[PDB]
């Protein structure tokens, strides 16, 4: 039929990324009883792909699509655009999607379109038989069938206004907003609206008021028609010459906005782009008056409008005209879990705690302290290490034992495991972070991860009374080594520099170094053995970060033995080394070094024979 | 909207972009406007023709007995030093002169009316030396039309010069803006054309694409109104939104202040408050729509409670927060910024004795709603909060005259 | 995996087994989604075995290699040798 | 980026380096190696406050994911 | 090269595979995954053959490096 | 590392210390091979400190901590979370 804009076989494409819109379409397509979605695809300008949304509580994909030519290709059963593009681009758009020969509707939402171009679309859409709702409106909506986009806002809304069943009353206005409290007006006062439209406040629309009323007029199922206007333009006068012309038989209730005009000073401007009286007969007294005199019931201001409805509707109703209608069953529809949650309805519980850090507020907090407040302190990387790991605000001597040892940790050459293995993937061309991982990976008993063996073992002997010789002894005799004792290059005859850095901050800085003191004995008795079993950097890290933990004050005796038993100190290792590892990745970048191979010459090759393959 | 243009910005136009459609740069771009901080000498350094040509010097204000004709650049001195600032009323309106044009006498014969104006199928240019009407439809343009057929009963020897005059003119119309155009009169110097006045509207939604043309222009206030610093300022927030955020000032001193959501409620709310006779207390016109955030719904509220709470008014001072069922515009994030606004102006609205009326639907509302209860039982100050239940402006009798 | 049985690109993996999909098989259907022609699934299997390994010296088995020689264990050893694959090996 | 930005106006402006070595230190990466160094200290705290905790295997929630199978139609051709 | 090669002409001529996949599989980078997958059997051969050998923990030679370090004055400007 | 005393960029472990160069001056030596200006070392330092925690929900400390709780190793949970570090996040 001419005269249908939408029905329940409307399909739509969404021109632009509005997900709030999209869901509301789809969440009406499923409280009135739709087979399928009323939308065919969205129109993404900036990225073709697929969008999830909801079908009741079921996830549901809708394609997405960069170009409207593309889309209408795809979907041509499609012949509404909903047009969320900017006044930028809703002209482009528009014209556009009325050159597509599947395209019949174009709704046209953008505020601020210029006046020329609006009047380009309309006499376009007029040319080629086809509707522009629009700009700077909502749309419109027709009760069960279909709705553009946000018409008629909340679920709760349209249960509340019975829109998801039709009436008998033909609705059009300028404004949105006004649209959707006059669907709540006339479903209090009557079976409710049929259909509804919001041709915008532009005054040049892509539609006049009168295009949609006549259409109301040939509808069988309309009765009633009733119309909010508003001053500024001759748009009404359309209406008014249709009523005296007779080409309008079905009873129109009609008001016309803006009888505060002449009141106020003649250089007002209101709130939509033609809401301007320039010359009488612009006026919104002109304009109800020339309706009052042309046969349309027209009330004596907005707050009896819905009187006026109630009035027409029941002489419809006692006539015969209108027949009274059993009420469908009330649609329901599960509500959004984040309403739910923000009106306190419901409760969710959290998976995870974090108690080092939180970014969620205002501003950074490292344990409780705020970002601003650790660097107006000056406490340094340290003091940060301090926060994060420990949950402390260490003494200073205790932070800056912590930069300490990563400067003295940074690096010990290409050669050792970790550097070694990040060498090999730079060489290979990979990237800095592959690079650096593929090298912290080897970080464990025998390179660099000894430091929590370290601290444990010896805390252990020292603690359990036993003398350094039996300790000595009692590792022997197990088969273990002794954690932090021996290295592959330093020894008596090359001393490390490193651990007696370290022992002279320790003994300059802490109120006590027993555990120092402990290992320095067994030291004795390795090296008396073997040259090469020294006091390691990884031992020594571990045994003077226990004393600090024990002479600082900070830690109580169950902290300490907690943070043993978790291994915290071979995280100062991995950090510190990090350094030298990218300093190494980022050498032989610079150096434009090829991929290596290991040499052949440097492997024994001694494959096992058939025999001791076949059998054990 | 459609914008009016001061008579030296609009002869201007037509003096930098008419001569790319005609082929007759006759009428040079020789104005000169003089303002309140006007310097003469600086002007006169700026035109040296003021000196040694004819003058003619009229206000520009956007409107007789005021025009000056045929005189020295000492004559039209005079005429500046006694009119300006001087208190005249217009229309019932009474300002201060500040804009006068200045620009050279063209001694004529003829007086020819020319006007473009737009309808809903097209654009029509009327003329007269009684007056034709020439529809130019919007997809055909001017090109399809033989303007020739024109008045007989005394063009001849120029009927071909206003011929191409009134179609460079339509040109000049379509790729420049305007939303009207009216030279009231022109007339022939020689073989050229000259417009004598000049009165020019511009579709302000044109300025994204009209951005090399309008460079030398900016929108004047209407005569007797002088610039508000808070309507420019909402000016500015809704130029870099998508929403819409819209005040005029009626009356600074006025008891009822609104801040209505929608283009087509704010009206109606306007219209209540007239229709109970409180015309003269309504302090202003405003409007927000389109989703704006709590970021823009925040400095528009701060605005609005600024100006009402500068003047204390014995019977104490109305704020109606009203607006229909919105159909997006989220009213808890919305609320959420005037929630904010009033929080920050508590002792200020105590002090006014101010009394607060909402009325919303709308995304959220019982949300938003929720808030100013909460708001209005801690704030010290009466906030009546109304939902979709209460008609859309039962909260104008109920403050006005409950 | 939610369901009474767990399905590779909706496929049981029974009805994987029964029909004998194979090694190349399940790759058709957990990369490709598609259940492949036989041949196409047999040269997966084939590529498979023909680069299980090319010795000790390459980057890769070198790295692993290396973190093992160092103590550690099976995972971070094999992470250490397969952050190598880019651009020059593999 | 603010880091990145400010390392290039630092290099440039410190007197330490020539616009070649500037051009090199681009070119190569050398940047996100702050932010991996950085970040480390933040990341090894996180691990051991779950240690401290006690932390359970995590699995993430069924209900955060939406199996979306191919039809056997679709696994058979193209 | 072999592999990369020869999944192509695979693809293109199983019937399975439409255009638009094949340019997809293409521009993602699927066949990596197969080298990575194929090459840890040899890696975890690789590694459980060095636990079986007792092996040590290897350092690289010294002789094998070559231990340039900028001069004083190489540090101090560009 | 292959004589008497550690040297960073030339310079010996003893002198780095000394001269208090700090984190920042190390990072200078082996990262840039220079012994930078003291205010462009602090401002190495300074990054360090601002970018070292941004909360547990970022995919690197995200991914860290699911391998903490799948009970790993504190460099497996580290290496785990810094290789999410790339052109989306850090
Ligand atoms: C360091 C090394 C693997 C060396 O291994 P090797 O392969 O040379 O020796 P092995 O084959 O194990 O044995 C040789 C003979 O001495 C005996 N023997 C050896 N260690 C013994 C011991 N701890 N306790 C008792 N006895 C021992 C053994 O029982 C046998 O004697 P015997 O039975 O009579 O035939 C080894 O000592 C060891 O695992 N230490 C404990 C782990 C440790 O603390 N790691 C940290 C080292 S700091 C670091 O990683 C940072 C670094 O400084 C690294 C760098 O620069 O290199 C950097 O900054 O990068
Ligand atoms: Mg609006």
Same mark, same amino acid.
């Given at each position: ?11 739509? =494409? ?41 079908? +009741? ?40 999607? *009325? ?39 909502? +749309? ?111 009873? *129109?209730?009609?008001?016309?906005? +803006? ?46 409008? +819905? ?133 912290? *990976? ?15 073992? =010896? ?158 | ?19 790319? $459609?005609? /082929?007759?740069?006759?009428? @040079? ?45 000492? %004559? ?11 208190? !005249? ?64 009963? %005394? ?19 379509? /790729? ?17 054309? !000259? ?15 009209? @951005? ?27 130029? @870099? ?38 015309? /003269? ?16 719904? $925040? ?53 006014? /004795? ?10 959220? $509302? ?10 209005? @039982? ?25």
């Amino acid at each position: 039929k001419d005269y249908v804009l939408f029905d329940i076989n409307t399909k739509a =494409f969404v021109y632009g990324y509005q997900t709030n819109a999209i869901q509301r379409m789809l969440d009406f397509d499923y409280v009135c009883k739709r087979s399928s979605p009323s939308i065919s695809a969205i129109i993404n300008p900036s990225r073709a792909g697929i969008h999830k949304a909801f079908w +009741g509580t079921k996830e549901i994909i809708l394609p997405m699509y960069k170009t409207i030519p593309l889309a209408a290709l795809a979907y041509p059963e499609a012949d509404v655009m909903v047009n969320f593009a900017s006044h930028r681009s809703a002209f482009e758009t528009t014209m556009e999607a *009325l050159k597509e020969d599947t395209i019949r509707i174009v709704a046209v939402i953008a505020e601020g379109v210029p006046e020329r171009q609006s009047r380009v679309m309309a006499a376009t859409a007029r040319k080629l038989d086809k509707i522009v709702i629009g700009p700077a409106t909502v +749309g419109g909506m027709t009760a069960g069938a279909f709705r553009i986009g946000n018409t008629a806002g909340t679920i709760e809304n349209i249960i509340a206004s019975k829109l998801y069943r039709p009436g008998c009353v033909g609705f059009v206005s300028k404004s949105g907003g006004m649209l959707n409290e006059a669907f709540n007006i006339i479903s209090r006062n009557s079976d409710g609206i049929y259909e509804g439209v919001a041709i915008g406040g532009d005054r040049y629309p892509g539609s006049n008021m009168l295009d949609h009323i006549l259409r109301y007029e040939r509808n069988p199922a309309i009765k009633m028609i009733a119309c909010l206007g508003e001053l500024g333009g001759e748009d009404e006068y359309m209406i008014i010459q249709a009523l005296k012309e007779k080409k309008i038989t079905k009873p *129109l209730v009609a008001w016309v906005t +803006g009888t505060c005009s002449p009141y106020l000073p003649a250089s007002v401007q209101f709130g939509h782009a033609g809401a301007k009286a320039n010359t009488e007969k612009e006026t919104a007294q002109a304009k109800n008056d020339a309706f009052r005199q042309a046969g349309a019931y027209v009330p004596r201001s907005f707050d009896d409008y +819905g009187e006026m409805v109630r009035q027409v509707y029941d002489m419809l109703l006692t006539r015969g005209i209108v027949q009274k209608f059993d009420e469908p069953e009330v649609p329901r529809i599960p509500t959004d879990y984040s309403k739910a949650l923000a009106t306190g309805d419901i409760r969710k519980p959290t998976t995870f705690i974090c108690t080092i850090s939180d970014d969620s507020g205002e501003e950074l907090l490292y344990a409780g302290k705020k970002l601003s407040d650790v660097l107006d302190r000056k406490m340094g990387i340290g003091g940060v290490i301090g926060l994060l790991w420990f949950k402390k605000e260490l003494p200073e001597y205790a932070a800056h034992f912590i930069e300490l040892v990563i400067q003295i940790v940074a690096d010990h050459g290409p050669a050792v495991s970790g550097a070694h293995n990040a060498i090999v993937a730079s060489c290979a061309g990979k990237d800095l972070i592959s690079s650096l991982c593929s090298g912290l *990976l080897t970080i464990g008993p025998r390179f660099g991860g000894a430091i929590d063996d370290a601290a444990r073992e =010896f805390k252990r002997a020292q603690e359990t009374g036993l003398a350094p010789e039996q300790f000595v002894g009692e590792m022997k005799k197990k088969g273990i080594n002794i954690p932090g004792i021996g290295h592959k290059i330093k020894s008596v005859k090359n001393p490390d520099k490193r651990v007696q850095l370290l022992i002279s901050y320790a003994r300059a800085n802490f109120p006590s170094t027993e555990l120092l003191n402990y290992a320095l004995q067994v030291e004795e008795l390795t090296t008396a053995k073997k040259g090469n079993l020294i006091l390691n950097v990884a031992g020594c890290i571990g045994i003077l970060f226990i004393d600090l933990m024990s002479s600082c004050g900070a830690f109580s005796k169950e902290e300490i033995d907690e943070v043993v038993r978790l291994g915290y100190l071979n995280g100062l290792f991995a950090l510190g080394r990090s350094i030298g590892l990218i300093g190494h990745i980022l050498d032989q970048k610079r150096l434009g070094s090829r991929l290596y191979r290991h040499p052949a010459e440097d492997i024994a090759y001694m494959m096992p024979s058939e025999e001791e393959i076949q059998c054990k | 909207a459609q914008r009016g243009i001061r008579e030296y910005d609009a002869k201007n136009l037509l003096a930098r972009y008419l001569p790319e $459609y005609l /082929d007759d740069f006759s009428y @040079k771009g020789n104005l000169a406007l003089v303002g309140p901080e006007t310097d003469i000498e600086g002007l006169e350094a700026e035109n040296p023709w003021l000196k040694t040509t004819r003058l003619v010097v009229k206000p520009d204000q956007l409107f007789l007995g005021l025009v000056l004709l045929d005189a020295d650049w000492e %004559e039209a001195k005079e005429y500046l030093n006694e009119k300006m600032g001087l208190e !005249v009323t217009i229309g019932g309106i009474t300002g201060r002169l500040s804009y006068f044009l200045i620009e050279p006498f063209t001694p004529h014969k003829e007086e020819y009316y020319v006007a473009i104006s737009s309808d809903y199928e097209g654009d029509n240019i009327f003329f007269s030396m009684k007056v034709i009407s020439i529809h130019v439809d919007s997809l055909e343009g001017i090109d399809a039309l033989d303007v020739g057929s024109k008045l007989p009963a %005394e063009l001849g020897d120029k009927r071909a010069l206003v011929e191409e005059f009134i179609t460079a003119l339509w040109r000049f119309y379509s /790729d420049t803006g305007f939303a009207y155009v009216e030279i009231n009169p022109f007339t022939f110097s020689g073989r050229g054309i !000259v417009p004598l006045d000049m009165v020019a509207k511009l579709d302000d939604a044109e300025e994204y694409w009209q @951005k090399k043309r309008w460079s030398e222009l900016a929108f004047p206030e209407p005569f007797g109104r002088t610039p508000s610093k808070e309507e420019l300022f909402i000016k500015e927030i809704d130029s @870099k939104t998508g929403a819409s955020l819209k005040l005029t000032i009626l009356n600074p001193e006025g008891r009822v202040w609104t801040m209505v959501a929608g283009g087509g409620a704010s009206v109606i709310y306007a219209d209540t408050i007239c229709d109970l006779g409180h015309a /003269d207390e309504m302090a202003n016109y405003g409007e927000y729509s389109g989703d704006p955030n709590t970021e823009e719904t $925040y400095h528009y509220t701060c605005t609005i409670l600024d100006l009402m709470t500068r003047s204390k008014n014995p019977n104490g001072k109305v704020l109606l927060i009203g607006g229909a069922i919105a159909n997006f515009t989220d009213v808890a994030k919305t609320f959420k910024g005037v929630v904010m606004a009033l929080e920050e102006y508590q002792q200020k609205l105590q002090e006014a /004795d101010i009394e607060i009326y909402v009325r919303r639907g709308g995304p959220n $509302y019982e949300q938003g709603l929720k808030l100013m209860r909460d708001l209005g @039982k801690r704030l010290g100050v009466p906030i009546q909060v109304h939902g979709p239940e209460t008609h859309m402006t039962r909260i104008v009798p109920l403050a006005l005259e409950e």
